[PDB]
Enzyme design. Structure first.
Site, PDB file in Angstrom:
ATOM      1  N   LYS A 186       8.616 -19.136 -10.465  1.00  0.00           N
ATOM      2  CA  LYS A 186       8.829 -19.499  -9.062  1.00  0.00           C
ATOM      3  C   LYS A 186       7.471 -19.276  -8.401  1.00  0.00           C
ATOM      4  O   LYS A 186       6.871 -18.212  -8.543  1.00  0.00           O
ATOM      5  CB  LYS A 186       9.972 -18.760  -8.340  1.00  0.00           C
ATOM      6  CG  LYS A 186       9.782 -17.300  -7.996  1.00  0.00           C
ATOM      7  CD  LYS A 186      10.958 -16.827  -7.124  1.00  0.00           C
ATOM      8  CE  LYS A 186      10.821 -15.381  -6.692  1.00  0.00           C
ATOM      9  NZ  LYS A 186      11.942 -14.980  -5.793  1.00  0.00           N
ATOM     10  N   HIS A 198       5.305 -15.581  -7.774  1.00  0.00           N
ATOM     11  CA  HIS A 198       4.199 -15.626  -6.832  1.00  0.00           C
ATOM     12  C   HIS A 198       4.438 -14.492  -5.846  1.00  0.00           C
ATOM     13  O   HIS A 198       5.394 -13.743  -5.990  1.00  0.00           O
ATOM     14  CB  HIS A 198       4.235 -16.971  -6.094  1.00  0.00           C
ATOM     15  CG  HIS A 198       5.460 -17.167  -5.237  1.00  0.00           C
ATOM     16  ND1 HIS A 198       6.743 -17.054  -5.731  1.00  0.00           N
ATOM     17  CD2 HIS A 198       5.596 -17.566  -3.950  1.00  0.00           C
ATOM     18  CE1 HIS A 198       7.613 -17.302  -4.769  1.00  0.00           C
ATOM     19  NE2 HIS A 198       6.942 -17.628  -3.680  1.00  0.00           N
ATOM     20  N   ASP A 238      14.408  -7.770  -9.094  1.00  0.00           N
ATOM     21  CA  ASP A 238      13.097  -7.800  -8.436  1.00  0.00           C
ATOM     22  C   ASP A 238      12.816  -6.434  -7.822  1.00  0.00           C
ATOM     23  O   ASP A 238      12.062  -5.647  -8.386  1.00  0.00           O
ATOM     24  CB  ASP A 238      13.037  -8.903  -7.364  1.00  0.00           C
ATOM     25  CG  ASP A 238      11.681  -8.962  -6.637  1.00  0.00           C
ATOM     26  OD1 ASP A 238      10.671  -8.446  -7.180  1.00  0.00           O
ATOM     27  OD2 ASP A 238      11.623  -9.548  -5.528  1.00  0.00           O
ATOM     28  N   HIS A 287      13.204 -13.429   6.727  1.00  0.00           N
ATOM     29  CA  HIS A 287      12.254 -14.533   6.906  1.00  0.00           C
ATOM     30  C   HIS A 287      12.741 -15.629   7.869  1.00  0.00           C
ATOM     31  O   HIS A 287      12.133 -16.699   7.936  1.00  0.00           O
ATOM     32  CB  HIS A 287      11.855 -15.183   5.572  1.00  0.00           C
ATOM     33  CG  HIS A 287      11.237 -14.238   4.590  1.00  0.00           C
ATOM     34  ND1 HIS A 287      11.636 -14.166   3.273  1.00  0.00           N
ATOM     35  CD2 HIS A 287      10.304 -13.270   4.753  1.00  0.00           C
ATOM     36  CE1 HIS A 287      10.934 -13.233   2.653  1.00  0.00           C
ATOM     37  NE2 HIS A 287      10.127 -12.667   3.532  1.00  0.00           N
ATOM     38  N   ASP A 331      17.928 -15.768  -3.939  1.00  0.00           N
ATOM     39  CA  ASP A 331      17.471 -14.397  -3.938  1.00  0.00           C
ATOM     40  C   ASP A 331      18.126 -13.819  -2.707  1.00  0.00           C
ATOM     41  O   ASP A 331      17.771 -14.177  -1.589  1.00  0.00           O
ATOM     42  CB  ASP A 331      15.951 -14.335  -3.822  1.00  0.00           C
ATOM     43  CG  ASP A 331      15.421 -12.914  -3.700  1.00  0.00           C
ATOM     44  OD1 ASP A 331      16.223 -11.963  -3.827  1.00  0.00           O
ATOM     45  OD2 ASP A 331      14.195 -12.754  -3.472  1.00  0.00           O
ATOM     46  N   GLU A 385      16.492 -16.163   0.168  1.00  0.00           N
ATOM     47  CA  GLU A 385      15.983 -17.436  -0.360  1.00  0.00           C
ATOM     48  C   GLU A 385      16.982 -18.282  -1.143  1.00  0.00           C
ATOM     49  O   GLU A 385      17.850 -17.767  -1.843  1.00  0.00           O
ATOM     50  CB  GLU A 385      14.813 -17.175  -1.340  1.00  0.00           C
ATOM     51  CG  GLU A 385      13.586 -16.444  -0.777  1.00  0.00           C
ATOM     52  CD  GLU A 385      12.519 -16.094  -1.850  1.00  0.00           C
ATOM     53  OE1 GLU A 385      12.671 -16.491  -3.033  1.00  0.00           O
ATOM     54  OE2 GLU A 385      11.525 -15.406  -1.497  1.00  0.00           O
ATOM     55  N   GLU A 439       6.169 -19.298   2.204  1.00  0.00           N
ATOM     56  CA  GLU A 439       6.275 -19.921   0.885  1.00  0.00           C
ATOM     57  C   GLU A 439       6.522 -21.433   0.917  1.00  0.00           C
ATOM     58  O   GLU A 439       6.875 -22.024  -0.101  1.00  0.00           O
ATOM     59  CB  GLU A 439       7.382 -19.204   0.109  1.00  0.00           C
ATOM     60  CG  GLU A 439       7.135 -17.691   0.026  1.00  0.00           C
ATOM     61  CD  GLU A 439       8.258 -16.911  -0.644  1.00  0.00           C
ATOM     62  OE1 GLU A 439       9.210 -17.535  -1.172  1.00  0.00           O
ATOM     63  OE2 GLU A 439       8.179 -15.658  -0.636  1.00  0.00           O
ATOM     64  N   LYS A 462       5.913  -9.795 -11.440  1.00  0.00           N
ATOM     65  CA  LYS A 462       4.877  -9.900 -10.398  1.00  0.00           C
ATOM     66  C   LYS A 462       3.691  -9.117 -10.945  1.00  0.00           C
ATOM     67  O   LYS A 462       3.658  -7.886 -10.884  1.00  0.00           O
ATOM     68  CB  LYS A 462       5.340  -9.328  -9.063  1.00  0.00           C
ATOM     69  CG  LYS A 462       6.500 -10.073  -8.453  1.00  0.00           C
ATOM     70  CD  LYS A 462       6.920  -9.495  -7.114  1.00  0.00           C
ATOM     71  CE  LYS A 462       8.043 -10.324  -6.525  1.00  0.00           C
ATOM     72  NZ  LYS A 462       8.501  -9.836  -5.203  1.00  0.00           N
ATOM     73  N   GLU A 480      19.117 -13.584  -7.761  1.00  0.00           N
ATOM     74  CA  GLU A 480      18.129 -12.522  -7.707  1.00  0.00           C
ATOM     75  C   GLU A 480      18.502 -11.499  -6.628  1.00  0.00           C
ATOM     76  O   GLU A 480      18.958 -11.863  -5.544  1.00  0.00           O
ATOM     77  CB  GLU A 480      16.768 -13.166  -7.441  1.00  0.00           C
ATOM     78  CG  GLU A 480      15.579 -12.246  -7.238  1.00  0.00           C
ATOM     79  CD  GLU A 480      14.297 -13.043  -6.970  1.00  0.00           C
ATOM     80  OE1 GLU A 480      14.203 -14.210  -7.433  1.00  0.00           O
ATOM     81  OE2 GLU A 480      13.381 -12.500  -6.306  1.00  0.00           O
ATOM     82  N   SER A 496       0.811  -1.217   0.000  1.00  0.00           N
ATOM     83  CA  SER A 496       0.000   0.000   0.000  1.00  0.00           C
ATOM     84  C   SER A 496       0.854   1.280   0.000  1.00  0.00           C
ATOM     85  O   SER A 496       0.310   2.385   0.057  1.00  0.00           O
ATOM     86  CB  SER A 496      -0.954   0.005   1.194  1.00  0.00           C
ATOM     87  OG  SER A 496      -0.236  -0.073   2.410  1.00  0.00           O
TER      88      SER A 496
END
Lengths: 444, 447
Positions: free
Chosen positions: B406, B383, B330, B165, B252, B174, B217, B355, B303, B41
């Protein structure tokens, strides 16, 4: 009047990455699809699903043999049949085409419960279209229920994990929250979601970020040693979220997992390194511990409080708590008619946990639900550890007018597609539906 | 032919339990549904979602306003239009009904990136139906690509998490595995699921049962301190599965998360308590560290190797790896045309992470993909952290003939949702499709 023009199956992956079977039934009205959740390939009471057992593929969990069964056995036998004859189709597959029967009923061993249920659900879905009705109303038709003033169920969200699903000391398998005090299901889902995120935050700050990673059903496995600690987190979360009195608690003991068969004891410390003799309880005593928590916490339902074959304990616990509390039979009943009838005669429990793939067919799922309902029992439709993108059980719970359903935490889309489906059902019905609420176990 | 008879929307829950919008476009040919994933947002480049921000409902993440926007602004504007005019519908919303913008293009702020994408995808499904084509083939015609010898993508499965994460020591966000050596997509998925489970039990023995719990994920967060420890687990997992040489690795870095603006250096130990393990690295040294791993392990894609605005490093890194490794953009691109164009000019990447909800519409998503492909870049459909049970990107990647996607680990149905869809598409096409395999960066042409 439509007929089965074609039936093809395929191998897809369930929520845990393991193969499962999906079926496509065709009629002049189009192609109708159904994906079956995972069950048990070996077992003594439940319907067994057919798995390839080929180590060179999916670690032996493939379902190619199941796909071939649908093509080579089920297809030729159903081409031309009316998909609306649900009973005729299910009994044809179970009794005639298969016929493998153990001492507790038809096992569905030759064709496999997975292959059978896939077709059963797909035909059921094609029939509803043939009749020009949404799935939920069509199920109601098959159950002999009415298609007006349908009851939206109370959802039971998994939140804390123990037993064999966690490395923690907690012996009980699942702790859930149920928003009986919500006005409608869309709100019920919000209360659930908010309380769930609040609980996540609590865990993140106390047990760390890594403790917020979820299990198969979307719940958390924090390092809590006893049921009291689990129960304490839930009451704090409910209160802090602002739903004190509107969200109740429920749990699944899965007592079979910590039962000592010979000495007939239940070891609440089966996971503790240092063992305590004071916690190796007899059934009657384990009962008293539960009765202790019922008076101290807002627990409204208890699942598998004892071993699957300990009818004595079940009966005693149900006799004492039955009126104001729900006693669900899962492993003890295995969604099996004969097992249920024995439970009824012994008053072992007062609620049936309904796992559709555990019995094998829609018709059989319905008769089991009806038997429970006719006997004064409640019925809670359940998901599986290994679910799919299919929201069938959502329409099932509404059609059978159970007013109760557990389909995981409000996390992981195989759990949410069911809850999302319920919200759509509610919009469609609008004023023509009511929420189970306080009457979840015995809807009006 | 057929026209739009009605457009409605509702509030559903995404994979993390947060609300998101779901749209239903209706025609005489039926009702077509589309659900959008989570976005952002706020931000200065990407298309912004519209969130209610109500302190007392869903922690301010409700989307009732978005649902009402569809009903009062979009619906009246689209009733009677042909759902097939994807470009006409997408631009009517982005440029006329909305019209909001920043120095990087239309933001889609007034109506909300989520409301517009939901409608765009639903109409796209209605259009496919009108033309009497499966969604993937319909998308191909919109992209001006052939519908005869279609290409299946190589899947990139999440497996090990780090950075923000995970509480572990791994700085990179990732690590993924990609079955480039599979013969077809259904096999690629098998290879993935098998290696994923082999990894799962390796982790189980070394870190315990709790370490096997999954993140957003579907991946794991084992307590590994470095990239080397993580890569060894993957190499080991791949060998146990018997796919050595057939499954490659990718990662990533999300380098923005460990970049020190004041110093202009990167810190691979930013999560360690004691802060003297090793000095912070410049773009130069960080590059050498990656080049170091490229020799050691079978990594084929990288990435976000550097900060969202460090074009100098990206360029230097992309320059000396060039043809032997894929370098995805990205955060640096954020699926924005103008960003892509700046990156193209600076040769910052050689691949776009697409995306669809980050740009806002299917039409814009398509030109973004087409811009990359005709400029020597690859395109990898992606995703979002917050997915739904909608498998739209499965048909998108096939229709766009990207060759790579992915969509999470082969765990959690919002992920398997897409992978299962690719397998159905493969069956449908039968002997009339090919697997990108070794050519995932730029699928070979048909002749």
């Amino acid at each position: 009047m439509v007929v089965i023009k074609d039936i093809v199956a395929r191998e897809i992956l369930d929520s845990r990455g393991n193969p499962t079977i999906e079926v496509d039934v065709s009629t002049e009205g189009g192609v109708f699809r159904a994906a079956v959740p995972s069950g048990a390939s070996t077992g003594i009471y439940e319907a067994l699903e057919l798995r390839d057992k080929d180590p060179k593929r999916y670690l032996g969990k493939g379902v190619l043999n199941a796909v071939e069964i649908v093509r080579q056995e089920i297809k030729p036998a159903l081409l031309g049949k009316d998909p609306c004859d649900q009973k005729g189709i299910d009994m044809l597959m179970v009794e005639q085409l298969d016929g493998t029967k153990n001492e507790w009923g038809y096992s569905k061993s030759k064709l496999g419960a997975n292959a059978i249920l896939g077709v059963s659900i797909a035909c059921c879905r094609a029939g509803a279209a043939s009749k020009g009705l949404p799935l939920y109303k069509y199920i109601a038709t098959l159950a002999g229920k009415t298609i007006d003033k349908m009851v939206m169920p109370v959802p039971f969200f998994n939140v804390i994990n123990g037993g064999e699903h966690a490395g923690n000391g907690l012996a009980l398998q699942e702790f859930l929250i149920a928003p009986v005090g919500a006005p409608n299901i869309r709100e019920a889902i919000r209360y659930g979601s908010e309380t769930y995120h609040h609980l996540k935050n609590v865990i993140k700050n106390k047990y760390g970020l890594d403790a917020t990673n979820v299990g198969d059903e979307g719940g958390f496995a924090p390092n809590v040693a006893t049921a009291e600690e689990a129960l304490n987190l839930l009451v704090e979360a409910i209160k802090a979220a602002g739903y004190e009195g509107k969200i109740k608690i429920a749990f699944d003991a899965a007592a079979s997992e910590f039962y000592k068969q010979d000495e007939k004891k239940y070891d609440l410390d089966y996971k503790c390194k240092t063992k305590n003799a004071s916690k190796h309880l007899t059934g009657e005593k384990l009962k008293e511990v539960y009765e202790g928590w019922l008076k101290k916490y807002p627990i409204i339902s208890v699942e598998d409080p004892f071993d699957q074959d300990d009818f004595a304990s079940f009966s005693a616990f149900t006799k004492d708590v039955g009126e104001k509390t729900q006693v669900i039979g899962d492993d003890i009943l295995v969604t099996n008619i004969l097992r249920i009838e024995k439970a009824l005669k012994d008053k072992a429990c007062n609620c049936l946990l309904l796992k559709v793939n555990q019995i094998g067919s829609v018709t059989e799922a319905i008769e089991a639900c009806l038997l429970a309902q006719k006997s004064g029992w409640g019925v809670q439709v359940s998901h599986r550890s290994g679910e799919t993108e299919d929201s069938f059980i959502a329409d099932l719970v509404v059609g059978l007018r159970c007013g109760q359903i557990k389909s995981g935490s409000p996390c992981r889309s195989e759990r949410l597609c069911k809850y999302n489906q319920l919200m759509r059902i509610e919009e469609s019905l609008g004023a023509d539906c009511v929420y189970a609420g306080e009457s979840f176990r015995h809807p009006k």
